[PDB]
A = this chain, B = another copy of it.
């Protein structure tokens, strides 16, 4: 019941943004580069470790251990969902898009069932190893913020962020393409006068998915569905 990895067993490698490592195969290491952790740096570490060690799911990033500040997880080869959708030459077929949506819904459903709120769900936090949800959370990111988020964070907030991810999948683009100033999005979305353009969705997009999307993007936090129903709907049409 100790996920403390004795330091010196890990061979850290190239920088990523976090290092690629070697422990009992390929691993991904997060090194907190400080002389001595502040009291704030300490609780941040415990909390991420505490919530990571309660996850055992195929669609959640595999936490492998910690070191005392370091967090060891599985190495994921490939790029994030952000790269593939926005900064990539190659697009995806619908069957794959719906598949990416389903796995993410499974992971999000798993977390919510464990009383865990990601509080930072976005296409950049979704690694396409097989969907892998990482970069945790408790138990630039403005585009994925619910109107009440601009305590605001809840299961409903994750539901909204999930809705934007759906929008990315079904359109390929980021929301609010006609805006280059962050302060107005904050104002317009925050007030309740701005919403993603669901007319941008592909012709291939099932009306079912387009409906579900609008539900997750509801202006009022309480009209948004729950992942048990979100997964049910996605699983059905698939």
Binding site for B on A (CB under 8 A): 1, 3, 24-25, 53-54, 56-59, 62-65, 74-75, 103, 106, 109-110, 113, 231
- Chain B nearest CB, measured from A200 CB (Å): 29
Inter-chain contacts of A65 with B (CB < 8 A): 56
Contact status A103-B57, CB under 8 Å: no
Partner of A56, one of B63, B109, B110, B113: B63
Contact status A74-B58, CB under 8 Å: yes
Interface of chain A, helix or strand or loop or mixed? Answer: loop
Contact status A24-B56, CB under 8 Å: no
Contact status A25-B58, CB under 8 Å: yes
What are some 22 contacts across the A-B interface (CB < 8 A)? A1-B54, A3-B56, A24-B106, A24-B109, A24-B110, A24-B231, A25-B59, A25-B103, A25-B106, A25-B109, A25-B110, A25-B231, A56-B62, A56-B63, A56-B64, A56-B65, A57-B62, A57-B64, A57-B74, A58-B62, A58-B74, A58-B75
- Chain B nearest CB, measured from A60 CB (Å): 10
- Chain B nearest CB, measured from A88 CB (Å): 22
- Chain B nearest CB, measured from A154 CB (Å): 19
Inter-chain contacts of A59 with B (CB < 8 A): 25
- Chain B nearest CB, measured from A132 CB (Å): 11
Contact status B63-A24, CB under 8 Å: no
Query: Of all chain B residues, which has the CB nearest A105?
Result: B25
Query: Of all chain B residues, which has the CB nearest A54?
Result: B1
Q: 11 more A-B contacts (CB under 8 A) besides A24-B57, A62-B62?
A: A3-B56, A24-B106, A24-B109, A24-B113, A25-B57, A25-B110, A56-B64, A56-B65, A57-B74, A58-B62, A58-B75
